[PDB]
């Protein structure tokens, strides 16, 4: 059980963060209400995206303050767990190359 996407690698000293409305990776197999979740720093730090209510912090509600967790959402998302998406079995599915919409702020080091 894995993230659906490849990682964001942190080459600098700043934690990952995004402006409100930014940071959810593109996934055309998902719908506008689905576009909400968290990045988790693993364990150069690698940060992996998980849809809300899935993955290692599936129990956290949106906005929970935890070191190594940041929250992201896109306009149109619904704040409901994405049990229908869940996580990725790497034996069954390749990781989606993490892709952000054009114009997204990325902090230095990413």
């Amino acid at each position, epitope marked *: 059980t894995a993230s659906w996407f490849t990682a964001l690698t942190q080459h600098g000293k700043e934690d990952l963060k995004f402006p*409100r*409305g930014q940071g959810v990776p593109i996934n055309t197999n998902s*719908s*506008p*209400d689905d576009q*909400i979740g968290y990045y988790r720093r693993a364990t150069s730090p690698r940060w992996y995206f998980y849809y809300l209510g899935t993955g290692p912090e599936a*129990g956290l*509600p*949106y*906005g929970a303050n935890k070191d190594g967790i940041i*929250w992201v*959402a*896109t*306009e*149109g*998302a*619904l*704040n*409901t*767990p994405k*049990d229908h998406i869940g996580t990725r079995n790497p034996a069954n599915n390749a990781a989606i190359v993490l892709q952000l919409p054009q114009g997204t702020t990325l902090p230095k080091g990413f």
Partner: antibody, heavy 122, light 108 residues
Framework: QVQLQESGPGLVKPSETLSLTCTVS????????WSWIRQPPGKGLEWIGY???????KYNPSLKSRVTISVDTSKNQFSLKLGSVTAADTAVYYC????????????????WGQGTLVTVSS | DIQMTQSPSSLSASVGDRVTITCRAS??????LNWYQQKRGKAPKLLIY???SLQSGVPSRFSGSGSGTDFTLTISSLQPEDFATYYC?????????FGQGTKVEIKR
């Protein structure tokens, strides 16, 4: 403060289509989710469906086969059509706004209309 | 769908008493749970969201508690204007579903 207003109360004949409109004032339709919710007399609340300002909808599976919800941003309105009604559809019909958390909508209904009583009767 | 079960169906309590009403879900919904107040002839009014967050403008005698399947709404000091039917509602997944309500009256 945001205000929601359903169209006026009255009759719908059995097997015909119920049509209601919700007009939003003091606020904008854009960026929020909006729902229709109903309450038969003496009973509890049943969610009918939601619409997002750009047009996508989602319906209660119990009603999906005979309901449409539409939205008209230029009129700051959204509307319900419920077909093939029977006495089981007699209810107060509410329009309601979903709250937001950051840019996400919730399933939390933070503003409601007054309610309009629709009686299904010949 | 997720079934919400409220208890009791009705209760009476004196002004200044604590009132606690229960809502239980058929599956775990963590803290995705809202409470509404409904007066006769009026729309429901959101009191509590996310199981325990007080909606802005709602008096601080209202609280919510629980996470998972077992939730309560507490009025810590009942006031004469607090008669109403109170409803819970899971906000975890569509379709959002409501309990059948608890009617609160003021004992005098």
């Amino acid at each position: 403060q945001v205000q929601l207003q359903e169209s006026g109360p009255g009759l719908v004949k059995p097997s015909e289509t119920l049509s209601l409109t919700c007009t939003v004032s003091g606020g904008s339709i854009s960026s929020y989710y909006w729902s229709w919710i109903r309450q038969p007399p003496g009973k509890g609340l049943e969610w009918i469906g939601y619409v997002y300002y750009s047009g996508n909808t989602k319906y209660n599976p119990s009603l999906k086969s005979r309901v449409t919800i539409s939205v008209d941003t230029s009129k700051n309105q959204f509307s319900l059509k419920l077909g093939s009604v029977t006495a089981a559809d007699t209810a107060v019909y509410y329009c309601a706004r979903h709250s937001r958390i950051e840019v996400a909508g919730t399933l939390d209904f933070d503003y409601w209309g007054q309610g309009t009583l629709v009686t299904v009767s010949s | 769908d997720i079934q919400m079960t409220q208890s009791p169906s009705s209760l009476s309590a004196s002004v200044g008493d604590r009132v606690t009403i229960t809502c239980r879900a058929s599956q775990s919904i963590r803290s995705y749970l809202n409470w509404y107040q409904q007066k006769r002839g009026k729309a429901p009014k959101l009191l509590i969201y996310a199981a325990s967050s007080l909606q802005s403008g709602v008096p601080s005698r209202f609280s919510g508690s629980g996470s998972g399947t077992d939730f309560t709404l507490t009025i810590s000091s009942l006031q004469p204007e607090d008669f109403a039917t109170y409803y819970c509602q899971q906000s975890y997944s569509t379709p959002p579903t409501f309990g059948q309500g608890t009617k609160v009256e003021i004992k005098r």
